Amino acid sequence: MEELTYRLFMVATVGMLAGTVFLLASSREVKPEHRRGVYISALVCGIAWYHYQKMGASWESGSYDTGLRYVDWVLTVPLMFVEVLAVTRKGAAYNEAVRNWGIAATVMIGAGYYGETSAAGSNEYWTGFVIAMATYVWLMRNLQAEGEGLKGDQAVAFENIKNLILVGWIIYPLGYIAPVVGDFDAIREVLYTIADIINKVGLGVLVLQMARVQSGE
Ligand SMILES: *C/C=C(C)/C=C/C=C(C)/C=C/C1=C(C)CCCC1(C)C
């Protein structure tokens, strides 16, 4: 439904802003040396807040720009890896992973955009899919490895961060392939919007929880 897609854009706008202000307000409840991930988490929700306002306006206007979603992803998806690295690493090791995982995440979204902006089932579509899927798997394997050697409450807090991404991000590549299986355009927009709220606000809340554990909570 077209009115549903629009209503969900408005629910996402409000959920993203609620997440932004929750995370900024909660940042003071954790120690300064563990705040970086909470701040980056709030920034991700704030960018998505701005983009969901623009998507809702674009939609109601009758000129829905499918590119707004990818501008949001190319910014927020690398930052989401960064907000996780901000609680698992510091110093040189953090900067190294921010560069390496951040570039990988940008390539994944860029390959997706290359494929999305072609005829469905076209060669460009499949090139995009394979390069983005390969980078996705590479990132999910890096995330699995990031947990190795963690202990006690930090191992449990990291498991939750890792599994939100592992389970919660499957919908994105699933949605991409859907249109070659049939007509799933309207449902894909709805499911991506719900997924974005859960993934972005949920990951920020779990990064906050890791930062609380690390602060001695
Ligand atoms: C806040 C938004 C998020 C976390 C969006 C995540 C999006 C992806 C993981 C997209 C992945 C894709 C592939 C793995 C292959 C097909 C192309 C994409 C870009 C849909």
Residue numbers in the entry: 1 to 217
Would you copy out the relevant sentences from the publication that reported this structure?
Here, we have functionally and structurally characterized a representative of the PR family found in a widely distributed clade of marine actinobacteria, Candidatus Actinomarina minuta, named MAR [marine actinobacterial rhodopsin or MacR (16)]. In summary, the sequence alignment and the photocycle measurements confirm that MAR is a member of the PR family, which functions as an outward proton pump at neutral and high pH. Overall, MAR consists of seven transmembrane helices, A to G, connected through short intracellular and extracellular loops.
The orange-form crystals that were used to solve the MAR ground state structure under proton-pumping conditions also grew at pH 5.2, i.e., under pumping-inhibited conditions. We determined a 1.6-Å-resolution structure from such crystals, which provided a molecular basis for the inhibition of proton pumping in PRs under acidic conditions and the role of the His-Asp pair in it. In contrast, the structure of MAR under pumping-inhibited conditions shows that His51 and Asp72 reorient to form a 2.5-Å short H-bond (SHB). Reorientation of Asp72 toward His51 in the low-pH MAR leads to dehydration of the RSB region in a similar way to that shown for HsBR in the L and M states: Only one water molecule, w1*, remains in the region. In contrast, under acidic conditions, the already protonated His-Asp pair cannot accept a proton from RSB, preventing RSB deprotonation and leading to the absence of the M state and proton pumping. While Arg82 of HsBR flips to the extracellular part in the acid blue and M states, Arg69 of MAR in the M-like state remains oriented toward RSB.
